[PDB]
Amino acid sequence: PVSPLKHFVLAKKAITAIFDQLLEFVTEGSHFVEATYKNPELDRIATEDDLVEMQGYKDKLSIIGEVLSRRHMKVAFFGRTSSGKSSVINAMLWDKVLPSGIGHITNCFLSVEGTDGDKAYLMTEGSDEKKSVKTVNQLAGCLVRVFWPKAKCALLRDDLVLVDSPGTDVTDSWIDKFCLDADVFVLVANSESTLMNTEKHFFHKVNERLSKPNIFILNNRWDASASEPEYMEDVRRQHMERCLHFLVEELKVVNALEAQNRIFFVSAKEVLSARKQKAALAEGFHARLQEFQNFEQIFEECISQSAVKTKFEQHTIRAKQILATVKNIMDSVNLAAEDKRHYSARLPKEIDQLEKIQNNSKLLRNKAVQLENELENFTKQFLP
Ligand SMILES: Nc1nc2c(ncn2[C@@H]2O[C@H](COP(=O)(O)OP(=O)(O)O)[C@@H](O)[C@H]2O)c(=O)[nH]1
């Protein structure tokens, strides 16, 4: 069972390798354009504008590679205090990463990301110090970053970052600082209550600022109706009706069939206890566990596909534009050299020098075409 998050990992590896090659190619092409422009025996074969363009591309292709190397998937959890946001995150991480009662006292956002080390730690905004996660109660707009060993959670190994927000009912400017790059928003609701307008309004604001945000609703604490099956079915219908209407008719972010794959009824407490033990069950436990596992699979499929487009499409488009321009420059150099060869070149040494320029510009043009093909292959595989 291969995690869908590997789609993102593979896309990130592919696009970073393309940009490594692109930087090397533009560096080589810039050296060629410079030598051609600077040759005192050549007039107007490569222009000063040709060189400035190539150097400008060279000067900015490195930071694209470094920026791409740090791209990650991000899921953000929202909901009323004690709905179960921290517990859902812990269940997905298979451990008690965010401590008990942290939701009572946290007024900062808490993010969880992977670390290559074997020791968990946290970092605050104004330093590089790695602090004990045992101080997270003291440290928790503000953001506290929790780092958890990648060897312990496959989600973190596969470049997912999970963000816990302060309770919606006791606090937006949240969107700008910690939501412009979130790929998925998860509303955690208390299934013993009813979906509230305070929660709806927040996702209305996300919806107005982002084009078709990916939104899941987890009706948590579903174990509270265990052994009440007839009751459970009717409460499920009522929650489903209200959650469907919100996603489909109010937000209009999903049609009614796809909405079935965005609303789930779960017990994060049961799931965490089952998973911490893996490293006398209430009635319906396994059905609820299976529903949480189905949510995780659908969530991973959603966020991996979505994040590849969101995080990598613009730079893929830019790389194609850079290559088209470099090809145009190589075309211009070749054409100017060949024109000169046939219009006014006289001595066989001048002719041989122009033929070398033609040949090297063609070698570079063909290298650009090969990188265009790699970008087309990337687009076909990763950018539907
Ligand atoms: N019965 C039950 N209790 C839960 C569930 N999820 C969380 N809780 C409990 O509800 C309390 C608050 O949960 P927490 O995850 O801290 O809520 P948060 O404030 O939204 O982060 C804690 O005591 C949890 O143990 C659940 O699925 N079922």
DSSP for 262-290, written as a single string = TEEE--HHHHHHHHHHH--PPTTHHHHHH
Taking the CA atoms of the chain, what radius of gyration do you get in angstroms?
A: 28
Residues 104 and 250 in one domain: yes
Ligand 1 pocket residues where CB is under 6 Å: 79, 81-87, 103, 220-221, 223-224, 267-269
Give the residues across from 78 on adjacent strands. 187
The residue among 114, 121, 110 whose CA lies nearest residue 149 is 114
**Cα–ligand 1 centroid distance for 218 (angstroms):** 13
Residue 353 · residue 41 · CB < 8 Å = yes
Enter the resolution in angstroms: 1.8
Technique behind this structure? X-ray
* Alpha helices (H) in 167-262, listed in sequence order: 174-178, 197-209, 229-244, 256-259
Residue with CA at minimum distance from ligand 1 atom 1: 221
Atom nearest to 104 CA in ligand 1: 19
Residues 173 and 88 in one domain: yes
**Cα–ligand 1 centroid distance for 269 (angstroms):** 7
Annotated binding-site residue numbers: 82-87, 220-223, 267, 269
Residues 130 and 209 in one domain: yes
Residue with CA at minimum distance from ligand 1 atom 13: 84
Residue 262 · residue 216 · CB < 8 Å = yes
Beta-carbon contacts of residue 334 (< 8 Å; ≥ 6 apart): 357, 358, 361, 362, 365
Sign of the four-CA dihedral 325, 327, 333, 336: negative
Residue 27 · residue 58 · CB < 8 Å = yes
- Last residue of one domain, picked from the residues 311, 343, 360: 311
Residues 159 and 274 in one domain: yes
Tokens representing residue 77 in the block: 């959890």
Q: How far is CA 155 from the centre of its chain?
A: 13
Sign of the four-CA dihedral 116, 120, 122, 123: negative
What's the domain count of the chain? 2
- Last residue of one domain, picked from the residues 263, 293, 311: 311
Ligand 1 pocket, mutate which of 168, 269, 272, 291 (most atoms under 8 A from CB): 269
Tokens representing residue 340 in the block: 């000169």
Compute φ and ψ for 107, nearest 5 degrees: -110, 5
Residues 226 and 194 in one domain: yes
Ligand 1 pocket, mutate which of 82, 83, 87 (most atoms under 8 A from CB): 87
**Phi-psi group of 165: left, alpha or beta (phi > 0 → left; psi -120 to 50 → alpha; rest → beta):** beta
Residues 12 and 133 in one domain: no
**How far is residue 270's CA from residue 289's CA, in Å, rounded to a whole number?**
8
Do the strands 121-123 and 143-149 form a parallel or antiparallel pair, or are they unpaired?
Answer: antiparallel
**Cα–ligand 1 centroid distance for 356 (angstroms):** 73
**How far is residue 12's CA from residue 234's CA, in Å, rounded to a whole number?**
45
**297-310: b (≥16 Cβ within 10 Å) or e:** ebbbebbbbbbbeb
**How far is residue 38's CA from residue 48's CA, in Å, rounded to a whole number?**
9
CA angle 276, 278, 283 (to 5 degrees): 85
Q: In what order do the strands lie in the sheet with 160-164?
A: 121-123, 143-149, 109-115, 160-164, 73-78, 184-190, 214-220, 263-265
**Cα–ligand 1 centroid distance for 333 (angstroms):** 67
How many alpha carbons fall within 13 Å on the CB side of residue 122? 22
**How far is residue 276's CA from residue 121's CA, in Å, rounded to a whole number?**
20
Beta-carbon contacts of residue 121 (< 8 Å; ≥ 6 apart): 115, 130, 131, 132, 133, 147
Taking the CB of residue 193, how many other CB atoms lie within 10 A of it? 12
Residues 96 and 40 in one domain: no
Annotated binding-site residue numbers for GTP: 82-87, 220-223, 267, 269
Residues 278 and 138 in one domain: yes
**Cα–ligand 1 centroid distance for 284 (angstroms):** 18
**How far is residue 248's CA from residue 262's CA, in Å, rounded to a whole number?**
11
Q: How far is CA 168 from the centre of its chain?
A: 24
**How far is residue 178's CA from residue 108's CA, in Å, rounded to a whole number?**
11
Sign of the four-CA dihedral 373, 377, 383, 384: positive
- Last residue of one domain, picked from the residues 278, 311, 344: 311
**Cα–ligand 1 centroid distance for 271 (angstroms):** 12
Q: Domain containing 96: what range?
A: 72-311
Matching residue, tokens 């080390």: 117
Residues 47 and 89 in one domain: no
**77-115: b (≥16 Cβ within 10 Å) or e:** bbbbebbbbbbbbbbbbbbebbbeebbeebebbbbbbbb
Residue 266 · residue 288 · CB < 8 Å = yes
Atom nearest to 100 CA in ligand 1: 16
Beta-carbon contacts of residue 351 (< 8 Å; ≥ 6 apart): 341, 345
Residues 196 and 326 in one domain: no
Give the residues across from 264 on adjacent strands. 218
Compute φ and ψ for 256, nearest 5 degrees: -70, -25
Residue 6 · residue 158 · CB < 8 Å = yes
**How far is residue 271's CA from residue 285's CA, in Å, rounded to a whole number?**
9
Residues 214 and 336 in one domain: no
Give the residues across from 143 on adjacent strands. 109
Atom nearest to 87 CA in ligand 1: 15
Q: What's at 330, amino acid-wise?
A: M
**How far is residue 236's CA from residue 9's CA, in Å, rounded to a whole number?**
36
**10-49: b (≥16 Cβ within 10 Å) or e:** ebbebbbebbeebbebbebbbebbeebbeeeebeebbbee
Q: Is 261 helix (H, G, I), strand (E, B) or coil?
A: coil
**Cα–ligand 1 centroid distance for 83 (angstroms):** 6
Residues 58 and 94 in one domain: no
**249-276: b (≥16 Cβ within 10 Å) or e:** eebebbeeeebebbbbbbbbbbbbebbe
